């Protein structure tokens, strides 16, 4: 392996030699430089004008090793910045890599899959350009087998990852017919036993559901919700994360779409999610809760039935502030859409004190959200003649002192809502 630690100059020398073997070893030397951890000299390789050469090498059917070496080299260049990815595309790599997907050498088709994943991963324009060149059909053909388990683990992982990049990004979202075409294969990958394939399949589904309800509907109608819910309960954090994101995405949609998440048993996992030691899981889970409490009354009722109100009190009592912010949103939504009975239950679970404590916060929006919530709870207290008991409760936990101080707040939505609450209930 005397292709170790070459200069760029020597690589250029060998590549310009018109000796295919000399080209092969110089290309391998480039692969090695480009596959090093510390500052691989991507720009120096680009400046030397090597990309068109590498691309031409992809087409050398008669010399498989150089196809492999250049595929690897181009992969690592395309993994760089957008400008570096663009240089690979500008050299015509896209159709060349797509032709390689049909190679008889698995390590070469795999390397093409990888490279296309890096190009598509750059953003929506390159994603859509890879689609226009017709990548999807030969990619899906690689997975047209009776049992995915007969495929090499690394190979299957690379294919899944690349497919997820075709599902990825917005402005614009991927073409509808593309998504339609990829979906049945994704649904199948979502049922595979490998933790990495599972994660990346979940990421893919998370991307597709990040948008307008019509995108969400395409996914929901495939029947993947129960499987997403199952994956929500996995032990592996890299599976739970994209599974939770996808579920969160779906409940931003219609009441009907939100009902399928509930019907699939999602709420039963929330006691763990809302107490998860990973901050981002707890925050995402609480956000999802807030969008569920923005649903119908019967859906608020299922939140109650699953014992999730005390978990919301817990999150409101102690959590990362951004999670507490989502919890406040969850409560205001609850108190806006809930019945009198459901609102009363909330107080009985102890919502008032941690609510009042967050009034000291240095964020204007959560103050607004909270003041709205207590306003809604008073409006429920009226229909019971028990507004007096609530005033005292709020006075006792030091809440009234907090609301008085808000009458002289910078913001105006704030100082009004405060004084408003004061003159109606505390006078």
């Amino acid at each position: 392996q005397g292709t170790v630690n070459w200069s760029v100059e020597d690589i250029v020398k060998g590549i310009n030699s018109n000796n295919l073997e000399s080209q092969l070893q110089a290309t391998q030397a480039a692969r090695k430089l480009l596959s090093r951890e510390k500052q691989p000299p991507i720009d120096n390789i680009i400046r030397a004008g090597l990309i068109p050469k590498f691309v031409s090498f992809l087409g050398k059917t008669d010399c498989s090793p150089i196809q492999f070496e250049s595929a690897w080299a181009l992969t690592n260049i395309a993994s760089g910045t957008s400008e570096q990815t663009k240089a690979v595309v500008d050299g015509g790599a896209i159709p060349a890599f797509i032709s390689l997907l049909a190679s008889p050498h698995a390590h070469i088709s795999e390397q093409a899959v990888w490279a296309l994943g890096n190009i598509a991963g750059d953003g929506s324009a390159f994603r859509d350009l890879v689609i226009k060149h017709g990548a999807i059909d030969p990619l899906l053909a690689l997975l047209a087998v009776p049992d995915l388990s007969t495929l090499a683990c690394g190979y299957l992982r690379n294919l899944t990852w690349t497919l997820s990049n075709l599902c990825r990004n917005k402005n614009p979202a991927p073409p509808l017919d593309a998504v339609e075409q990829i979906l049945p294969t994704l649904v199948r990958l979502l049922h595979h036993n490998d933790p990495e394939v599972l994660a990346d399949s979940c990421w893919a589904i998370s991307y597709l559901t990040d948008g307008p309800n019509e995108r969400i509907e395409m996914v929901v109608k495939k029947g993947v919700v129960p499987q997403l819910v199952k994956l929500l309960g996995a032990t592996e954090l890299p599976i739970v994360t994209p599974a939770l994101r996808a579920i969160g995405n779906i409940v931003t949609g219609t009441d009907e779409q939100t009902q399928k998440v509930i019907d699939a048993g999602a709420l039963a996992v929330f006691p763990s999610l809302l107490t998860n030691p990973k901050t981002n899981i707890q925050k995402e889970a609480t956000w999802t809760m807030s969008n569920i409490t923005a649903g119908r009354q019967d859906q608020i009722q299922q939140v109650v039935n699953h014992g999730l109100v005390p978990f919301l009190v817990g999150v409101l009592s102690k959590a990362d502030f951004k999670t507490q912010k989502e919890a406040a949103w969850a409560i205001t939504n609850y108190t806006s859409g809930g019945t009198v009975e459901q609102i009363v239950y909330l107080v009985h679970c102890g919502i008032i004190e941690p609510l009042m404590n967050l009034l000291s916060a240095k964020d204007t929006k959560i103050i607004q959200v909270i003041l709205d919530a207590i306003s809604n709870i008073f409006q429920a207290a009226e229909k019971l003649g028990e507004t007096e008991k609530l005033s005292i409760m709020i006075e006792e936990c030091g809440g009234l002192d907090k609301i008085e101080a808000l009458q002289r707040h910078e913001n105006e939505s704030v100082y009004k809502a405060s004084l408003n609450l004061i003159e109606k209930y505390f006078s």
Partner: peptide, 12 residues
């Protein structure tokens, strides 16, 4: 936490 959009193939 996040799936990377690009991935280099490292040396063995």
């Amino acid at each position: 936490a996040i799936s990377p959009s690009k991935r280099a193939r490292p040396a063995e």
